[PDB]
Design a protein around this ligand. Structure first.
Ligand SMILES: Nc1ncnc2c1ncn2[C@@H]1O[C@H](COP(=O)(O)OP(=O)(O)OC[C@H]2O[C@@H](O)[C@H](O)[C@@H]2O)[C@@H](O)[C@H]1O
Length: 167
């Protein structure tokens, strides 16, 4: 009855556990979880996890996101918005990490990860660690520092996983 017994994982803190795998697969195991999307300011879900989440939703995520942006305008870097879960999770928290390519302030990861504490169980990638160019260890450091809730941080690369878990 513990989904983590079926996954390669390491307990990091009493709050945070890191899992090697696919964040969408992990979130599907926890019906009351919130799944984080590593988004951009306009919720245009291209290429990384965001595109996978949109594909998993058969486009419904993008349609919702389109509507949201036209109603409310774009997010600022470091902001987040809770949107529907689309049967992937209870809800999807779209979080806008800093894009190092744009020279944005990496410390805005503090705000990103703080936004997760509103929810009792969160499944998240390492925000800003892919297309956005922030080192996985930097992103993980922020998460570890900020977490005050149950967080499953999920990494799809064994190489990233081992870089973060072997001490
Ligand atoms: N399904 C997944 N499960 C877990 N980890 C994942 C998954 N897919 C990607 N990753 C990893 O999650 C981290 C976050 O990577 P990105 O998705 O590229 O996120 P980010 O760097 O915040 O870039 C966001 C930007 O990319 C676009 O998808 C998004 O529209 C935005 O423009 C990276 O280490 C990436 O390899």
């Amino acid at each position: 009855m513990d989904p983590l017994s079926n996954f390669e994982h390491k307990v990091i803190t009493e709050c945070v556990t890191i899992v090697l795998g696919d964040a969408i697969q992990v979130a599907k195991c926890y019906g009351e979880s919130v799944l984080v999307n590593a988004a951009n300011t306009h919720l245009k879900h291209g290429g990384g996890i965001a595109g996978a989440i949109n594909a998993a939703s058969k486009g419904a995520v993008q349609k919702e996101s389109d509507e949201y942006i036209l109603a409310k305008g774009p997010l600022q870097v470091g902001d987040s918005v809770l949107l529907q879960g689309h049967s992937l999770a209870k809800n999807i928290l779209h979080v806008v990490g800093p894009d190092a390519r744009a020279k944005q302030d990496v410390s805005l990861l503090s705000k990103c990860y703080k936004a997760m504490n509103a929810y009792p169980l969160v499944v998240t990638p390492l925000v800003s660690a892919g297309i956005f160019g922030v080192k996985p260890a930097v992103s993980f450091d922020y998460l570890i520092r900020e977490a005050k809730t149950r967080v499953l941080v999920v990494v799809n690369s064994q190489d990233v996983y081992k870089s973060l878990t072997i001490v």
